[model samples]
Each structure stands twice: as structure tokens, then as C-alpha cells.
Target chain A: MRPARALIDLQALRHNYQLAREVTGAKALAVIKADAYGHGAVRCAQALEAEADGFAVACIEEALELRAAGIRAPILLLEGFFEADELPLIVEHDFWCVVHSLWQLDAIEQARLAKPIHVWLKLDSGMHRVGLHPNDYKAAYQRLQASANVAKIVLMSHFARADELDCTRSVEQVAVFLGARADLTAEISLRNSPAVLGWPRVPSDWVRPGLMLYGSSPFDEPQATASRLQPVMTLESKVICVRELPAGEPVGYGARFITPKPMRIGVVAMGYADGYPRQAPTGTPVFVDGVRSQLLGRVSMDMLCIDLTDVPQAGLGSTVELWGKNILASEVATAADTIPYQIFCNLKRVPRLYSG
Target chain B: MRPARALIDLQALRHNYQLAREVTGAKALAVIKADAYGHGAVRCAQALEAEADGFAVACIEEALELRAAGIRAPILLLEGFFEADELPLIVEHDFWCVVHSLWQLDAIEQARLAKPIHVWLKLDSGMHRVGLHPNDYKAAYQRLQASANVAKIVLMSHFARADELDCTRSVEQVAVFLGARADLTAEISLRNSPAVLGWPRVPSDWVRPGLMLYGSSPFDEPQATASRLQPVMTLESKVICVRELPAGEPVGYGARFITPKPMRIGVVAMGYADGYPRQAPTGTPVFVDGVRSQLLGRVSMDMLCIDLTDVPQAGLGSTVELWGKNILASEVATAADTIPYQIFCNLKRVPRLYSG
Candidate 1:
């Protein structure tokens, strides 16, 4: 196995799961799409199968993977199926799916099935990425109500700016969603990861939690809600080589890090290949020898240099944790000029060893 | 099959391989490390076996996969063996290795092997990332030459600014390398992908071409050499959902993009989770319906919105090529505040389909 690996803590995952449930006070579908945000879908879903209300994936393929892994929990397809051809499998597996478009509703409406399908009727109250328009939201609900193929319809709408609690977009979107489902009698799922933690006043029969499940905070600002979450995946590697350089010499590709006076550069066996953000600039913090060490130069394809000048004891094969319990993945994401979502999702090359 | 995928063209890879050879008369080792820069390694090495002089990978694991795949070409571990324990595997597979650190040289010297290992003695030159300094370059070379486990030795150095032709760093680094190996008689390799095109004046008995083989130029600076290369991978997806938004409506998370006027938004089945950069702001070009269209809002985890306002014909299931022959990977990399190498390697969630 490679020196760099992601240590996934199932206990941490369950902690985050409990935290999600505790915070939301509603049934939560643990989002396991995008391979559990790069934490490995099957393993994460399996770990949470006995506890999570259900698992939510972006597409049927992701849900199918869980099914193949013998996870019989109610799986929800967040974006639902891209084609009508996937309707049969959804029915066979008894998976809950989102009806975000008229074509998907039409597909469910016309498909022949031995069992009725559970549908999450999505309303585009604000976030325009997916879901039905507010004008046609109830009409689609009415259409689903009349269809014999539908077993249950849950009204759900995504927030545009739940992370920005000060923003009025969430409140505005809440008004629109509540109005659309005013006369409709169905379970409601309005909060995602951000809203599930941020919007306590919003009513939700079910909440979808993604980033929180991975032990990462979703917001750019400091949130007391995010503090309750725990990190599940720890990205780590070892220092393979170390060099003591004079002040005038530069380090790494582009000679991006020219030493001011003198510096001890430790070349880590982790880089963009291991899904460490290449955008991570010179000041990005990485825990080396169980202590904070700032990155020194441009992240190479297979290696990155770190300033080891502060620690004389740090040398070859010293443990370096990129992000985890001690060092927040969110901080690394901020340094990389991205979010924890991209950091978690982009991590694939490293072999993730599960523990706890 | 997933809607988002990277379509790798084997023929185009071959075309780029030929271009590398034609441009640099020196024998070239095809760098297929990082899973062939996220293109499948086994398939790519298989496609080049008949013509490539040799193959180069970052580690023993990457090389072993090709050996397991029945590839008969000599494989070089560019970062070399991370541990002395890997010596047995390297000898067993007849793998070539690099002597970057003194410890690596010492490992080679002490190892009891059935066969001699091929060695590439590295000089630091100007890039402080790896390799021995000029003072120890030939001493390391002489030490390797005298080692019982050594079969062949190649003197090599990497450039700091080969991608920037306007910079004198490459020339200065070249002078240092040549001055150090002034009287040494050994096969040499100082030119990587950038130098193979940008610094043809640099002396070389062998060259290692990575980016160019994948049909991408390393430099942001426009090079005439880049024009000769053809793209080998086309990152594409489909418009899974389309929404007509009223003016002032926000499109995605952060409410980062607000529609100034009533517009059509096509949600592509590609986003940061699929390795479409999250940093890509509004107006990033995406090819839709064979015509260029600007991206609308902040990219979501599994989806990104693009302007369908201009490409009126582009609707649900409309072909969206993020980058390929129609769209330059370099162009997208530039827009995402990264380089082409990162853009190629960051792609993971999408399924990759190969074609000739």
C-alpha cells in the first residue's frame, strides 16, 4: 500500500450521524453520493446501515453499489435517475427517488411496476441546480397523487444560501416551499447539510446530511452548529525525504518557495495525485510530527515540500496528517481556496484505511 | 454507465507519442504514472508498448500493474523505491529505479539481488524538490557505477522553469547540470515534458515526456510546440436538467451567481465531485451543442449550471464537452486557477471510456 492513505473512522461517522439527528430532531438520510464524498460509499453506507434512517446517493448507480454490498436500507436517489430506463431497478430495489423534473415524473407515471415507487417531489423554491419550478410544483404533486405507480411523495426544496445565516434567501425560499405544499399532505424535507445545522426553525420531516456526515463543517463562517460535528476521515502521509537548504536556494516546481535565510524542507509522499489540493499555496498548514507545519512551495504531482525549520526533530518517515481531528479539513480547504466539499470529494488516489 | 465520463482517445495518445519522439530525437520513456494522469494506466501502456522505448511510473505499485497486465516494456520508477523492502519486487520485475537521495543509493549498494537494477542518478540542478546537489551529482553517479546491484546509470536533473521559456532558470539550471557532469560518460536525461519542447538546446541521451504524451502542454505561455499536440481525453457529460429562471434568481450554493435577466440554465451532470473545478466562476467556457457557452453559477457537488440562453437548441441530454478537441483542457485549467496537469489528474468521479 502507498504511504499516503485516508484513515476513515466509522465511530466518527456514527458520531456525526448522531450529531445530525440530534441537531435536526428529524429523520436524516445520510448522503453517500460521490462515493460518500470520497470516503468510499459502500464502506460508509455499510457502517451506517444499522443506524442511519436511509442512505441518499446522487444517482441509481451509487444506490446500486450499496445494494450490491447487501445494504438493504431505504436508499434515496438525490438527483433520481437520468433516464427512464432506470425506473425498473428503482422499483425492484425499493429505492426512494427525487422527481426534480417533468420528464422524471412522466417516467414514473408511465412505467409498469410490480410495486409503487416512493418519490421525493423536489420544488425549486430557490436553488436552481435541480427541482421543479414553484409555479408547477403543486401540479407535479397532483400528477403524482393521481398516478397509481407512486406510493409516497415527500415535498422537498433545497436552500440557496443556508451557509450564510445572515442572508434572507433561506427565509424567502422557506416561504415559497411552504406555500407550494400548503394544501398538500406529505412528508417534508427542506434542509440539506447546511440548513439541517443552520436553520433550526425550518420544519423538516426528514433532513439530508452530506458534509456533516464526513465530520466537516459546511459554512465559510464560524458556526456553533458545525462545532457539534466530528471529522471522520484523516488524510495522512509520511515524510520520505528531507533537505537542509541555504537561504538563497528555492524549493519545488516553479522554484516557488525561495528560502529567506535557511530552511529544512521535508518532501512528503503526498501531492495532487493523492487528492491533496494542488491549489494549496505556501502557507497551507499540514500537521507534521504531530505539530503544525506550513507548506513551503507548489504542490507537485507526487510530492510537496513543507517547511520543517521550526522542528529539528522532524525527519524522514515522520507522521504528517494533512487533515483530521487535530487539523481541520476545512482550514486546508480555505487555504486551497475551495470548500471542504471539494477537498473531501477530490480525495481518491489515497488508499483509505478504515478504523475506530 | 455514468452520464459524466472522460473519453480517452488511444489514437490521439499515439499521435502525441509520435510527436514527442519527432520533436526530441532522443529516446523517450512514456511517463504513465498517476494512473496515466488519471487515464487508465494498463490500457495506456498497452497502447504504447509496441512503440515506446520504455515506460516510467511514479512508484512500484503503478509499474506492477502494467507488469501484471502482461506489458513487456521496461518500467522505470521515477520516484524510485520508497523502501529497501521494495528492492526484491523491483529486482523480481526487472524494474528501473531512480537514485534521488543518498539513502536510496545506499539501499541499492547493500541490497542482495538476483539481478542488477537500472538506476537514474538525479542532480538537484535548480529545482530543490528532489535529486542530489551538483557537488554530489557525480559522486552519486560514480557510487552507482561501482555498485554490484547496478545495471545501467543515467545522469539526470529536472528544470524549474522549463515551462516558462521567457525565464532564464532553465538555461541556468542546464549550465549547472552540464558543468557538474562536464567529464562524465553516462546516458543523460535533463528534459522532462516542458524541456522536451521548450528547451530543445539542452543535451539529452534520453527524455521523459509526461504531459505531452497526454496531449497537454505544461506551460501557460503559448508555445508553437503545443500546437502540434492533439488532445487525448475529452471530458464530457449531458445536460440532465434545464430550468428557466426569472431575473435576480440565484443558481447554486452560496447564491454566487445571480441572473441579471431572464435566462435558461442547463444543469450539467458534471461538477466538483466529477472533478469539474469548483473554482470555475461564472463565464467559464463549456462546449454545449457543438457551440461554446459560458458557465452560469458556482459549481455544485454533482452538477454545474451553464447558460442555455444562447445555445437555445441545447436542452436535456444535450451533449456537453467540458474540455477536449472543441475545448482546450489548458483553457479550463486557466479559468479554474490551476494548471493542465492538475485539471487532468483531478478527474476521478466520472467514468472513463477509451476509444482509438
Candidate 2:
């Protein structure tokens, strides 16, 4: 078995989901897309199955993967159906589609299904990447209502800067969305991970929680003991080699870390190959043998050197936590100049060992 | 049947191996660790089967992976045996081990087998992470020579900053290595990917080429014609959504990118989930439908928005190259503040369809 592995706690996942549900009184739509942000969709979906009212995935394939895994939850395609060819699969699987464009609208209208398909019309609001424009929102709503195949219509809009505590973009977006489509009587989904946790004022029928369900705070300025979420995944590895370096010596490739003084360096089994962010610069915190230590230098392909000078007791085969309960994944993400979402999503190479 | 895939040319792999051979005129130890740095080891090994003098891997598993795939080649374990239990496997597989620490030496000495095991005594020249210290190098060397189980020894040292053109540290490292083992008469193995490509002065009996073998130039100032290595991997995806946003409109999560003027944006299928660097900031070059475009906002899990203003013809399903012939992986690595090695190794989640 591989020493370097991701310890995924199913119990923690459920706890986080429950926390989100308690905080946001809205219906919980678990965002299990991109393999549940690389937590393995089937596993994460199974964990959130009892609590989550519905589920959301990026594409039909992801939804199908859940179906194949024996999940009977309502799955929503966030990007909607990419092509008209995927419409039949959407209908067959009973998956909800987010209709963002006119072509998607045309496809939904054309499809003759055994039963009417539930559709979510995404409004542009302030974030102009996807969703129907405010000018076209009313017309699109009318079209969806007129279509015989569309059984249910829900208004959905993504928050642009909801993660930013001081940003007024989410407020403006909500205002713009409600103003344009106020007359349409349908279930609304305005809150994502950040909105559900921070923006309590944003009213919605369904709240999509992604990062929060995985037990990571979305806020840049995390409040004290707020959002009591348990971190689901713990990325860990063992120290393969330990070396004592004399003063003025260097470690790792490119000589990135020159020993300030006589220091002890431990070569960890995990590196960029194991999905420990290569962007993690020096000073990135890593827990080694129950003691916190700073990363020494540039991450190599299969190994990372840690300054064990402060923790000399940590020797070969010492357990090192890249991210988990002790050291948050969010902190490591920050050090890597990314977010906890990327850290979770990009955990590709490491074999995930699930635990309850 | 993904259109975007890594086209690993075996002829090119052989060409590169031969090129390395010509440069060193020494025994070429092809470093095929990390699954040949994610190029698929079996295929790479077969391609360089005749050309490569020996194969170097990070561990026993990598070596075994190649051997199980029926690669009949001499393999050297770079990190060596972690425990005494792996000694039998190393002997059975005919894999050479690097004896870095005294514990490893003691383990090797204790494992008294019928056949003498080939070993590489790694000396800490300047890189203090691994290898025996200069003071202890001779003692370890003498012990290995005296052991009946030890067949041959190769003195190996790794350069700390060989990638830099003006690497004074590499020179110092070479001097230290040579000075330490002046009396020892053994096959010397030194020089990695960077040293094999850039440093011509410190050529030894064996040269280990890793990154350059995967069609990436290790030179700081890459030579145009001579080292014209073809890109083995082309990370590409199609534009799933295309939208025209009004001026001052923000895009993606946290409103990271705002449209200065009314502009067209194309949502690419590839993102951080697909191993595209998350730290890759705005304005990072992305080739869309044979035309150059720039990433407009923060990378999403399953998608990234690109400025399609320049390429007006590019729309939905239009192919976009994240890194390849049009946009070099090295350039993307630079933009992400990383190296080509990390870019290649971190491509885990995406399903790789290999081409000849």
C-alpha cells in the first residue's frame, strides 16, 4: 500500500453538510461536480445522500457516474447540457439542467421526453460569464413556461464575489436578479458556499454548498470558531529520509533553501507528484510527527524537504500532514496562492483512503 | 477519444536519448521515475530500450512497474531501499540501490544474499538533503567494498542549481564531490536533467536525464535549433460556453476579472481540476481555435474563462490549447511561478489519451 494517502472522513463530511443545513435554512443542493472537487463523487455523494435535498454536478457524465454508483438523488447539471445530444441522457437520468443560453433553451424545447424535465434558468446578474442576460431573462422565462417538456422552472444566479466579506457585488447581483425576474413564481437558488455561510440576508429556495461541505471556510478573514466544519480530507505522507545539514548548506533542487544555521531536514515522501501544490513556496507549514514545521525549499517531483530543526525527534518514517485537522487545507492553499477548493480538487495522484 | 492528448513520439524519445548520449558520450542512465515523469514509463522505456544504458527510478515500485510491463533493462533505484524487506525484491529484480545513509548501509550489509548487489554511494556534495557526508563517505565506501554481498559501487552526487546558466554552486558541488572521493576508483554517476542539458564541464561516467527526455529543454536560455525538442504533451479542451459581457462586468468567482470594455469570453473545459495550474493568473496565454487568447479570470474547477475578443470566430466547442505546440508548457509554468516538471507531473485527474 502507498504510504502517502488522503484520509477522507465520511463522518466529517456529514457533519459539515449538517452544519451548512443548520446555518442556511434553505434546501441543500450538494455540489458533487468535478468528482466532488476530487473527493470521488460516488463516495462524497453517498456520504451526503441522507441530508442533501439534491445534488449538482458539472456535466451529465458526472451525474451518470453517481447514478451508476447507486445514488438515487436528484442531480443538477450546473453548466447545463453542453450539446443537444446530451438532452436524451439528461431526460433518461431525471437530472435537472441549468439553461444558460438560447441554444440550450432551443434544445430543451425540441426534446420530446416521456416526462417533463425540470429546468433551472441561470440569470447573468453581475457575473457575466454564464447565464442569460437581464434583458433576455424575462423572455427566456416565458419561453421555458410555454414549453410543454419543461415541467418545473427555477431561477438561479451565481454569486460573483460572495467569498469577499466586504464586496458589495453579491448584494448588487441579488438585487438585479430579483428586479428582472420578480414576477416569475419559481424556486430560486441564489446562494453558493460563501452566501450560505456569510451572506445570511440572501434569500433562496436552494443553496449550493461546495467547499463548505468539504469542511473549509470560504472567507478570506475566517471568524473565530465560526462555521464549525470538520475537514473531510487529510493529505498525509511519511518522511522517507532524514538528513542533518551543517550551517551554510543548501537543500532541494535549485538550492532554494540555504541552511540559515545547522539544521535537520526531513525528506517527505510527498511532493508535486502526489498533488502537494508545487506552488507551495518556502515557509508553507507542514505537520511532522505531531510537530509543526516549515517547508525548507523547492518541491521536487517525488520528495519535499522540511526544516525539522525545531523537531529533531521526527526521523525516518515520521508521519507528515500536508493538510488536515491540525493544519488547515485553506492555509496550505493560501501559501500556494490558491484556494482550498483547488487543493481539494487537485488531489489527483494521491490514493484516497476513506474513513467514517 | 479526446482530441487533446499527449502524443509521445517514441522516435523522438530515442532521438532525445541519443542526443543526451552525444552530449555526455558517457553511459546514459535514463531517469524514468514518476511514471517517466507522467509520459508513461513502459512506452518510454521501450522507446529508449536499446539506446539507454540503464534506467533510474525513484523507488522499487516504479522499477517493478516497468519490469512487470516486460522491460528487460538494468534499473537503479534513486532513493534506494527504504527498509531491509525490499532488499530481496531489489536482488530478484536486478535493481541497483543507492546507499545514502548508514542505516541503508547497515541494512545492505545485514542482507547477506548469494549474489552480490550493485550499489551507488550517494555523497552529499553541496545538496544536504540526501547522501553520505564527505567525512563519512570513505568509511561507507570501505564498508561496501569489504561486504561480500556488494558487487560494484558508483559514486553519485546531485547538483543543487544546475538549471541556472551561471551556477557557481554547481561548480562548488563538483569540486566538493571530487575532493571527497579523490582516492576512490569507481564508476562515477552525476548530472541530472539540467546538468545533462546545460553543464558540459562536469561530465561523469553516467549521466541521468529526466526532464529533457520528456521533450522539455532544461537549459535556462533554451537553444533554438540544436535542442529543438518537440512537446510530448498537448493539454487541450474545447470551449463549452461563449458569452459577450458588457463593460465593467466582473467574471468568475470573487470577481477576479472585470471587463474594461465590452468583450467576448469563452469558457474552456480545462481548469484546475484538469491539472492546469490554479496559480496561473489573468492574461496567461491560451491558444483558442488556432488563435491566441488570454485567460480572463480565476480558474474554476471544471472551467476557465478566456478573452475571446481577439479571436472573434472562436465559439462553443472551439478547441483551446492550455499548453503545447502553440503555447509551451514551460511558458505556462513560468506564468504559474513553477517549472515544466511540476506542470507535467501534476496532470493527474485528467484522463490521458496517449498518441505515438
Best by lDDT: 1
Candidate 2, residues B185-287, lDDT tens digits: the string is: 9989888877877778895999988887777877657564236576767787777678877798778887778789999888776667767887889999988
Q: lDDT tens digits, residues A209-266, model 2? A: 9988888888879664344878888999888777876888767887777888888788
Evaluated on chain B only, candidate 2 has a TM-score of 0.95
Error in Å for residue B11 of model 2 = 4.5
The candidates' DockQ values read 0.73, 0.56
For model 1, the superposed segments whose C-alpha errors exceed 4 Å read none
Per-model TM-score of chain B: 0.98, 0.95
lDDT string, candidate 1, B110-222, tens digits: 87899988898888888888888788877888877887788888888888778887899988988898899989888889888988887878888888899998888788767
Compared with the true structure, what per-residue lDDT tens digits does model 1 show for residues A99-180? 8899988887787888898989888887888888778988898899899998888998888888887888899999989888
Clashes of each: 2, 0
Q: Which residue pairs show backbone clashes in model 2? A: none
Q: Report clash pairs, candidate 1.
A: A215-A230, A247-A261
